[PDB]
């Protein structure tokens, strides 16, 4: 009987700051689900952090050990919905949230590691493992509580069944053409126009600029870019939760002329009514949010209030695959596109599977959206993402693409990493 013998965690942080979040140090609360089977059989996952607090985030994950060690691998793998709820339904853990913040993300990491585990066992890349599950198996993994007023399991099944026929075709299409990507690398001011042109030349059909500090600057930067990009390249803007409702409206109306693909997080990630009010005031400028959205219940409300034109999704922010599947289904039912958030540490490696699984088994739509891409720390992963002319190549190796190089962990663990031992000297 294959069993999960250990839940190991590492506080891993990269000094990226030496290259509304200034000086962030991309970090990861790295989790590994060890078993007593082939050394090849293990689950990998991680929570993306930005520096301080990564140690508390790691401790939250380590606190989940008793819930997992001793569990039968086959039992976890055969009931991922049940495994997620064993963590999700621990009322004492819920008190620390519920389903939000540090505790919930820690849980999401362990859940993601479990899916990585199942994918490896099925010997398939996660996106395929997900898309090839029966409509019934998919639905069993999702938590429908608090969602019956917007998405019942029957409605979820309907969507998945109506898409089952084309799964074979979409799979081939994806493997042949890849998934659309967009860059934020040029948007972090002669550089703006330059980097923008290179982006287009590299094949990216969408670009995103940061805004929110000065209207004048934003107006100028958006103009220069629109003209430096042509009128057929999509250009988005991210305000990073900076504005209040009134200011956000006044601000975005001054950027409208430069053809905005969408404004990301114009206000607080908790303000559902606020995003809707902003959207109404700056029409037709599209509004989005999502990288910090706590759980499927807040997403449900975003959709219900018509507060978004499109939505971000994040692999490590919520309750793992189980929760993202629910969100993807919500988005599909309400007819709003999803542009996955990525970047940071391994976010690209992770979120690509979710987007690809959505295309194959749930929407069959990918040319109308794109996965975010940022060129950072990909070398620390065994299965780094591959961008071919502005598009994500479908991963082939088994898993969630979460596994990191031991040498990387050995070099950047905090504060005992070979680098951190020398640094603090
Ligand atoms: Mg952002």
Curated annotation (Swiss-Prot):
The active site is at residues 210, 341. Coiled coil: none annotated. It holds the Pfam family MR_MLE_C. Substrate binds at residues 26, 208, 240, 264, 291, 341-343, 372. It catalyses: L-fuconate = 2-dehydro-3-deoxy-L-fuconate + H2O. Binds 1 Mg(2+) ion per subunit. SMART domains: MR_MLE (SM00922). Its cofactor is Mg(2+). Gene3D superfamilies: Enolase-like C-terminal domain, Enolase-like, N-terminal domain. Mg(2+) binds at residues 238, 264, 291. GO terms for biological process: carbohydrate catabolic process. Belongs to the mandelate racemase/muconate lactonizing enzyme family. Homodimer. Plays a role in the catabolism of L-fucose. Catalyzes the dehydration of L-fuconate to 2-keto-3-deoxy-L-fuconate by the abstraction of the 2-proton to generate an enediolate intermediate that is stabilized by the magnesium ion. L-fuconate is the preferred substrate with 15-fold lower activity observed for L-galactonate and 8-fold lower activity with D-arabinonate. No activity detected with D-fuconate. Can also catalyze the epimerization of L-talonate and D-ribonate, but at slow rates. This is L-fuconate dehydratase. It comes from Xanthomonas campestris pv. campestris (strain ATCC 33913 / DSM 3586 / NCPPB 528 / LMG 568 / P 25).
